[PDB]
Amino acid sequence: NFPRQMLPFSKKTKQWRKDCLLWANQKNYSLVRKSVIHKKINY
Amino acid sequence: AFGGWLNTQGGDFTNGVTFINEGGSHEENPYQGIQIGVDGAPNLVEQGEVVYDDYVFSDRMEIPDDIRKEYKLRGKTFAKAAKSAQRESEERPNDPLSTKGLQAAMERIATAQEEARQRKEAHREG
């Protein structure tokens, strides 16, 4: 779960940012892009 | 050096606040301070003070509660108040809103320090 971004700058602590990056690691769907397998096949 | 600086991505970006650290007290330093520049030529400063726009915020002086309530200061000293007012600008020295807010805060704290110094001078001469 991506942390809350309605915070003041004071409450955007180190652990808040570490949580953001851990979420990014935990992890693709887009509306105007092809799948990665499609692009890989083309290349 | 981390004092009022954001040294990231191979650059050195500052919010303008000069954390004048590592020198020492006026009496403890053989040169009577750090002597940042020449202008009074002996512009001497100690370890606890901070400077914004060539204006020195004194660490030895305290914050009267009367001056605490109005202008809404946070630190126990004027240097600490300046250090707390510029926390928001350190991580974003390029942001125009941060620069404007820092300028406003520094003017407020400067006026508060001038008021405190006038009050102390008047009381001492009294």
């Binding site: 971004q5 309605m6 003041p8 700058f9 955007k12 180190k14 940012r17 570490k18 953001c20 990056l21 990014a24 690691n25 693709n28 887009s30 509306l31 105007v32 892009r33 092809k34 990665v36 692009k39 890989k40 083309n42 290349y43 | 954001l6 040294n7 990231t8 991505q9 191979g10 650059g11 050195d12 970006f13 202008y71 809404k72 007012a85 928001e88 991580e91 974003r92 020295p93 390029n94 942001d95 125009p96 809103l97 941060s98 404007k100 807010g101 406003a104 805060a105 407020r108």
Partner: protein, 297 residues
């Protein structure tokens, strides 16, 4: 032909504010030359140098600076070759992406692999600037991460870079870009000299100056944030993105270094050139397979 120059869109359009900024700059140069010139020995040389800048304008000086920067860096980096590679990427994928960043203090421009960028939270927009969150996952050498994060890597992180088994010996560099939100204040103040209402934007920590007619409101506004993870243990440059791509009137307009486009049609997925030549290539391969088997027999 490749000559991309910064031009003034309306070069005969000068206003009072431009003139004021020009006057400020000339006063600053005058002060500098008085400071440096040693008692008339070269003061007249400096005056001779800066006299021809009086006929310049603010827009002219800005345009000269921008052209200088772009000229030098185009010739230095061979940017046209980067664009040729990106054009090939666009014809293969229908996606052309570039990242602008500061590395080692200089601006740098890089072509993003379409397979190594994860673009989230866009609105059927073919532009890549419109995304609210982008993740860049790629494998960097230790030399590159130390070239890029020497001034923020801790000794523990560098020991981590040493102690890896190194059975290629690259490091997984995952970079997150995301639009956070900041609370800012829209303060309305009166010009002291003239009864003219004025507007300004300040952060949340600003104290509204009562007893002067200043009334305030609280808005939530986009802020571009970034953060980098190297390997699995290193956490670097977690902060607001120091390059806020700001606009004059809108505090919420910001984006990341990533710029690109999708070569699509009407909010759809891109039907690339390779896509529309591929079925024919497969039929060619099958028919040539029949031809080869005939040649063998």
């Amino acid at each position: 032909v490749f000559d991309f120059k910064v031009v003034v869109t309306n070069p005969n359009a000068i206003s009072e504010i431009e003139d004021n900024k020009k006057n400020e700059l000339l006063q600053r140069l005058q002060e500098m030359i008085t400071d440096t010139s040693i008692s008339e020995d070269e003061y007249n040389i400096k005056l001779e140098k800066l006299n021809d800048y009086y006929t310049y304008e603010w827009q002219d000086i800005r345009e000269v600076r921008a052209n200088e920067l772009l000229n030098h860096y185009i010739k230095e980096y061979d940017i046209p070759l980067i664009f040729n590679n990106g054009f090939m990427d666009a014809m293969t994928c229908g996606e052309e992406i570039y990242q602008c960043d500061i590395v080692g203090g200089e601006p740098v421009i890089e072509r993003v692999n379409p397979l190594k960028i994860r673009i989230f939270k866009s609105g059927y927009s073919n532009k890549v600037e419109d995304a609210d969150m982008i993740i860049l996952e790629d494998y960097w050498s230790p030399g590159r991460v130390i070239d890029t994060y020497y001034d923020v890597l801790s000794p523990k992180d560098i020991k981590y870079i040493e102690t890896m088994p190194d059975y290629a010996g690259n490091l997984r560099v995952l970079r997150l870009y995301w639009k956070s939100k900041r609370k800012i204040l829209k303060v309305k103040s009166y010009d002291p000299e003239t009864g003219e209402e004025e507007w300004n934007f300040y952060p949340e920590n600003y104290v509204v100056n009562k007893e002067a007619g200043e009334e305030v409101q609280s808005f939530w506004v986009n802020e571009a944030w970034e953060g980098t993870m190297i390997g699995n243990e290193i956490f670097v440059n977690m902060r607001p993105r120091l390059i806020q791509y700001n606009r004059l009137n809108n505090p919420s307009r910001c984006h990341f270094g990533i710029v690109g486009s999708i070569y699509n049609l009407n909010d759809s997925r891109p039907f690339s050139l390779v896509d529309m030549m591929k079925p024919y290539n497969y039929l060619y391969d099958a028919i040539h397979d029949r031809l080869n088997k005939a040649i063998a027999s």
